[PDB]
Write an enzyme that holds these catalytic residues in place. Structure first.
Site, PDB file in Angstrom:
ATOM      1  N   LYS A  90       0.798  -1.208   0.000  1.00 16.81           N
ATOM      2  CA  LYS A  90       0.000   0.000   0.000  1.00 16.81           C
ATOM      3  C   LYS A  90       0.846   1.281   0.000  1.00 16.81           C
ATOM      4  O   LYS A  90       0.285   2.332  -0.194  1.00 16.81           O
ATOM      5  CB  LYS A  90      -0.939  -0.011   1.198  1.00 16.81           C
ATOM      6  CG  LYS A  90      -1.997  -1.096   1.210  1.00 16.81           C
ATOM      7  CD  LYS A  90      -2.874  -1.157  -0.001  1.00 16.81           C
ATOM      8  CE  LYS A  90      -4.001  -2.179   0.095  1.00 16.81           C
ATOM      9  NZ  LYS A  90      -4.527  -2.484  -1.246  1.00 16.81           N
ATOM     10  N   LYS A 122       1.310   5.134  -4.969  1.00 17.84           N
ATOM     11  CA  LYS A 122       1.923   3.872  -5.287  1.00 17.84           C
ATOM     12  C   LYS A 122       2.597   3.945  -6.651  1.00 17.84           C
ATOM     13  O   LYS A 122       3.763   3.545  -6.790  1.00 17.84           O
ATOM     14  CB  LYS A 122       0.886   2.752  -5.297  1.00 17.84           C
ATOM     15  CG  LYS A 122       0.284   2.405  -3.937  1.00 17.84           C
ATOM     16  CD  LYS A 122      -1.158   1.944  -4.106  1.00 17.84           C
ATOM     17  CE  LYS A 122      -1.889   1.720  -2.811  1.00 17.84           C
ATOM     18  NZ  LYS A 122      -3.316   1.555  -3.161  1.00 17.84           N
ATOM     19  N   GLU A 143      -6.385  -2.083 -10.551  1.00 20.31           N
ATOM     20  CA  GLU A 143      -7.461  -1.810 -11.498  1.00 20.31           C
ATOM     21  C   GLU A 143      -8.046  -0.425 -11.202  1.00 20.31           C
ATOM     22  O   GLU A 143      -8.743   0.131 -12.019  1.00 20.31           O
ATOM     23  CB  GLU A 143      -8.606  -2.839 -11.389  1.00 20.31           C
ATOM     24  CG  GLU A 143      -8.425  -4.033 -12.289  1.00 20.31           C
ATOM     25  CD  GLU A 143      -9.353  -5.157 -11.959  1.00 20.31           C
ATOM     26  OE1 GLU A 143     -10.216  -4.876 -11.088  1.00 20.31           O
ATOM     27  OE2 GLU A 143      -9.261  -6.265 -12.591  1.00 20.31           O
TER      28      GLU A 143
HETATM   29  C1  LIG Z   1      -6.611  -7.106 -10.757  1.00 21.23           C
HETATM   30  C2  LIG Z   1      -6.375  -6.541  -9.367  1.00 21.23           C
HETATM   31  C3  LIG Z   1      -6.787  -5.255  -9.068  1.00 21.23           C
HETATM   32  C4  LIG Z   1      -6.477  -4.653  -7.845  1.00 21.23           C
HETATM   33  N1  LIG Z   1      -6.600  -3.298  -7.729  1.00 21.23           N
HETATM   34  C5  LIG Z   1      -6.147  -2.745  -6.634  1.00 21.23           C
HETATM   35  C6  LIG Z   1      -6.180  -1.351  -6.490  1.00 21.23           C
HETATM   36  O1  LIG Z   1      -6.596  -0.601  -7.360  1.00 21.23           O
HETATM   37  N2  LIG Z   1      -5.624  -0.813  -5.363  1.00 21.23           N
HETATM   38  C7  LIG Z   1      -5.133  -1.606  -4.329  1.00 21.23           C
HETATM   39  O2  LIG Z   1      -4.681  -1.074  -3.315  1.00 21.23           O
HETATM   40  N3  LIG Z   1      -5.186  -2.946  -4.409  1.00 21.23           N
HETATM   41  C8  LIG Z   1      -5.622  -3.484  -5.532  1.00 21.23           C
HETATM   42  N4  LIG Z   1      -5.661  -4.856  -5.627  1.00 21.23           N
HETATM   43  C9  LIG Z   1      -5.095  -5.647  -4.523  1.00 21.23           C
HETATM   44  C10 LIG Z   1      -6.187  -6.590  -3.910  1.00 21.23           C
HETATM   45  O3  LIG Z   1      -7.136  -5.931  -3.104  1.00 21.23           O
HETATM   46  C11 LIG Z   1      -5.534  -7.712  -3.104  1.00 21.23           C
HETATM   47  O4  LIG Z   1      -4.976  -8.540  -4.029  1.00 21.23           O
HETATM   48  C12 LIG Z   1      -6.443  -8.603  -2.300  1.00 21.23           C
HETATM   49  O5  LIG Z   1      -6.992  -7.917  -1.188  1.00 21.23           O
HETATM   50  C13 LIG Z   1      -5.699  -9.762  -1.729  1.00 21.23           C
HETATM   51  O6  LIG Z   1      -4.660  -9.279  -0.807  1.00 21.23           O
HETATM   52  P1  LIG Z   1      -3.142  -9.573  -1.266  1.00 21.23           P
HETATM   53  O7  LIG Z   1      -2.898  -9.194  -2.720  1.00 21.23           O
HETATM   54  O8  LIG Z   1      -2.384  -8.847  -0.215  1.00 21.23           O
HETATM   55  O9  LIG Z   1      -2.987 -10.962  -1.029  1.00 21.23           O
HETATM   56  C14 LIG Z   1      -6.003  -5.465  -6.824  1.00 21.23           C
HETATM   57  C15 LIG Z   1      -5.818  -6.826  -7.060  1.00 21.23           C
HETATM   58  C16 LIG Z   1      -5.894  -7.352  -8.308  1.00 21.23           C
HETATM   59  C17 LIG Z   1      -5.583  -8.822  -8.513  1.00 21.23           C
HETATM   60  O1  LIG Z   2      -8.553  -4.352  -4.518  1.00 16.67           O
HETATM   61  C1  LIG Z   2      -8.796  -3.194  -4.289  1.00 16.67           C
HETATM   62  O2  LIG Z   2      -8.605  -2.644  -3.206  1.00 16.67           O
HETATM   63  C2  LIG Z   2      -9.263  -2.343  -5.396  1.00 16.67           C
HETATM   64  C3  LIG Z   2      -9.493  -2.856  -6.648  1.00 16.67           C
HETATM   65  C4  LIG Z   2      -9.886  -2.000  -7.659  1.00 16.67           C
HETATM   66  C5  LIG Z   2     -10.049  -0.671  -7.370  1.00 16.67           C
HETATM   67  N1  LIG Z   2      -9.928  -0.183  -6.160  1.00 16.67           N
HETATM   68  C6  LIG Z   2      -9.511  -0.998  -5.191  1.00 16.67           C
END
Ligand SMILES: Cc1cc2nc3c(=O)[nH]c(=O)nc-3n(C[C@H](O)[C@H](O)[C@H](O)COP(=O)(O)O)c2cc1C
Ligand SMILES: O=C(O)c1cccnc1
Ligand SMILES: Cc1cc2nc3c(=O)[nH]c(=O)nc-3n(C[C@H](O)[C@H](O)[C@H](O)COP(=O)(O)O)c2cc1C
Ligand SMILES: O=C(O)c1cccnc1
EC number: 1.-.-.-
Lengths: 216, 216
Positions: free
Chosen positions: B13, B73, B164
């Site tokens: 994060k 980020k 995303e």
């Molecule tokens: C395609 C994709 C989109 C995501 N978009 C965001 C995002 O925009 N911002 C963010 O902080 N985390 C984003 N995440 C992180 C997810 O919330 C996270 O993968 C999920 O909570 C599982 O936790 P981990 O990746 O720590 O295991 C995204 C994950 C994926 C796979």
């Molecule tokens: O996984 C997330 O936290 C996330 C995914 C897409 C957009 N905003 C947040």
């Protein structure tokens, strides 16, 4: 190192039916499926892991028509994973996810928790209400799972092949997926290659980075 | 052991803007992008890797509206990968792929090569002529690449977060992607987490296998 694994793994074209995953490897591949990331931790997936001959043969029925060349890989491999996506994102799933995040200790306050739910609901809603692409969106998360899985199983020393060459309507009906809320996307046999795997000795080919990649 | 890596990696994060990929890590992450698998080795993707302050700032503009929480980020991380898919699958790309397979030594005869071309064209045509879903199909391959990438960079000891939450129309226009035949899907900053990454000390949460996984 992982780069060697990425350079040495291949799509297996034929498996040895007499070489089984160890009990420990069978656990580990389930761990990879479970612990993949997904957008908002939405985890919009289901997996079928077939390791009995019966259950692989059920999955192999989907390899009919044009797709018979994949049938034997599904029968001969030790374990066969079917990656399935949810067909719609419902509020019950979104609640289950956040409750699980809560049970696992990710929220300091009820308010952090409510904010998480609110943010997941907001972003989910953009797909299921505004864009009407929530099927596609969930399917993408599942392909991401696959990508993770293929590198994972290669690093455990296992052979595998991702397969889109199968009939999803057949496989869906064979396991009752429509009525349960799921649809099958990719099948990944895992095990050890046989002598009939012609792809094991071929060099890997990818496009050059001067085409596919830009630095700024 | 890749299972540890899968269990220990997290979506970062907040990144330390002073900690850069070694030049060797910078090459290795490009290798992961390139050598992902894809359906028919179609490789229907483009990557933008931003390492300079200018280049990252261009990417970070896509973190506008209510996607501002992701802007930092994209700015603080060492390298930022934009995963893009082709918007249509044309015959020029299919030819380039097979010519490359040829140059890399995968065909014994001109006939083997023509058969490969025929098979790729047949399966591609099912998406671009019968189902009209070739955009979705290609985008799936890209998500698979992502999944591979995230596990790969965690195994190199790097932190990352898939995103995303950004505005693809902005990012597309910022790099001229539409006219070049591409659309942006996911953005992945890579680097090392700062002590402001609250997510590095939170437990990981996943739905239990008794919901998501069925053995047969
Ligand atoms: C395609 C994709 C989109 C995501 N978009 C965001 C995002 O925009 N911002 C963010 O902080 N985390 C984003 N995440 C992180 C997810 O919330 C996270 O993968 C999920 O909570 C599982 O936790 P981990 O990746 O720590 O295991 C995204 C994950 C994926 C796979
Ligand atoms: O996984 C997330 O936290 C996330 C995914 C897409 C957009 N905003 C947040
Ligand atoms: C989503 C997906 C679907 C695939 N479907 C099949 C398949 O049905 N049959 C097959 O033999 N290979 C299939 N492949 C394997 C690819 O052809 C292979 O990944 C590609 O040629 C690159 O070779 P590698 O996987 O050995 O690196 C598939 C690949 C992916 C990613
Ligand atoms: O990649 C392949 O060889 C492939 C993909 C889809 C269907 N049949 C074969």
């Amino acid at each position: 190192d992982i780069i060697s694994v990425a350079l040495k793994r291949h799509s297996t074209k034929a498996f040895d039916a007499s070489k089984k995953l160890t009990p420990e490897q069978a656990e580990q591949i389930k761990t990879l499926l479970q612990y993949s990331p997904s957008s908002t931790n939405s985890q919009p997936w289901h997996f079928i892991v077939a390791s009995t001959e019966e259950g692989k043969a059920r999955v192999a029925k989907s390899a009919a028509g044009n797709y018979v060349f994949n049938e034997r890989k599904m029968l001969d491999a030790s374990h066969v994973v079917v990656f399935c996506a949810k067909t719609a994102m419902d509020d019950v799933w979104l609640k289950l996810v956040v409750d699980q995040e809560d049970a696992d200790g990710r929220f300091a306050t009820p308010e952090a928790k409510a904010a998480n739910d609110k943010g997941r609901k907001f972003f989910a809603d953009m797909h299921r209400k505004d864009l009407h692409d929530d099927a596609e969106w969930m399917a993408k998360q599942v392909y991401l799972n696959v990508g993770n899985f293929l590198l994972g199983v290669a690093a455990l020393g296992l052979d595998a092949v991702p397969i889109e060459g199968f009939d999803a309507a057949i496989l869906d009906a064979e396991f009752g997926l429509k009525e349960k809320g799921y649809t099958s996307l990719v099948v990944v046999p895992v095990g050890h290659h046989s002598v009939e795997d012609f792809n094991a000795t071929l060099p890997k080919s990818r496009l050059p980075q001067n085409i596919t990649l830009t630095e700024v």
